[PDB]
Ligand binder design. Structure first.
Ligand SMILES: Cc1nc(C(=O)O)sc1CCOP(=O)(O)O
Ligand SMILES: Cc1nc(C(=O)O)sc1CCOP(=O)(O)O
Lengths: 196, 195
């Protein structure tokens, strides 16, 4: 079984983004809130809209803003490269599930040592010096926490990623840039099932 | 009689340049608010490393917005934007922090005091702004730092009206010589205290 993570695209007004989030929630396993260029005031407004729209809070992951996760009762955070260590986070907030975004074998190895719960590895298909799919396989062999692949994920590339050993994939533009995000998300989950 | 001088960073400069400026001005101001709204956590933490290795006094530092960065950097002072966390929330989890709120009307100032802020920044002041500042200073009993168009020639009016301090962004960080800009503000404050 392979997880599907949806990643918001830091491009839409909160009302539109909120609608899309509510619509796709049963087609994906996790939704990462990654609105880098919005203020905390705007992100809290977004969260208020999806909470009152009935979103299942267990599926939400806050990228980067540990403070917003803490004051919104969101229990999963994704930490970018160069930001807080998982050790600092876990020392004071042991209830948090913690992901690390990593871009090399050695950074993946170090994340497991600092007690991350899982890693996001990419950018897999960006033209990492072409080493994306091979490294994915090397990382999976070397660590024992889950590995989620990100960067250029499309339905036609999922077999390669699956064969390399990924425990799931992460998708941004493939869903949130679609004219029909629900259908877009469905293409991914259908392909994932058909590979079974 | 002592009026505080708060310098506010301007979210416009590469971290290396901003670090240099912060170190040169540190003895001329009382507080420096890190307000790099467009930069990531990784970049802000790189800024803090540069100024810590440059020798800065950490007790002068205030984090705007990013309570997580303040906490994991042993900075004890945060400034909370309008529409963000309430001071009550912050104080329940991190009671050792000194907490400021940014407010833009008399009613928002009164509310900030009720929600247990330690002080407010009120702006933008720059006749209508100063009058409102004066009205707030009777309405609440926590300190009020005035912000918005603060220049040396406007400092006497602001002080006479009751401000406990002033906050300055472009008057310092948009200068050719940020240290000499800061000195103009501190010299004028000193004259006023002695006169
Ligand atoms: C959000 C993100 N993180 C990456 C990493 O390597 O950390 S690559 C990426 C963007 C993925 O976008 P899309 O599905 O449109 O390709
Ligand atoms: C950061 C900030 N807050 C304001 C408020 O009214 O809340 S005005 C402002 C910028 C003030 O810049 P300068 O000294 O260049 O006039």
């Amino acid at each position: 079984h392979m997880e599907l993570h949806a990643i918001t695209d830091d491009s839409k007004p909160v009302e539109e983004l909120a609608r899309i989030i509510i619509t796709i929630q049963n087609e994906v396993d996790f939704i990462h809130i990654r609105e880098r260029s919005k203020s905390a005031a705007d992100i809290l407004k977004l969260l208020d809209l999806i909470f009152e729209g009935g979103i299942d809070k267990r599926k939400l992951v806050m990228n980067g803003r540990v403070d917003i996760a803490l004051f919104s009762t969101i229990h999963r955070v994704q930490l970018p490269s160069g930001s807080f260590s998982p050790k600092q986070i876990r020392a004071r907030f042991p209830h948090l599930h913690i992901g690390r975004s990593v871009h090399s074998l050695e950074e993946a190895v170090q994340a497991e040592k600092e007690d991350a719960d899982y890693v996001l590895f990419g950018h897999v298909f960006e033209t990492l010096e072409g080493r994306g799919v091979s490294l994915l396989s090397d990382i999976k062999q070397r660590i024992s926490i889950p590995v989620i692949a990100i960067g250029g994920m499309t339905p036609d590339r999922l077999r390669d990623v699956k064969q390399a050993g990924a425990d799931g994939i992460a998708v941004m533009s493939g869903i949130f840039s679609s004219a029909e995000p629900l259908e877009a998300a469905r293409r991914y989950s259908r392909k994932l099932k058909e590979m079974r």
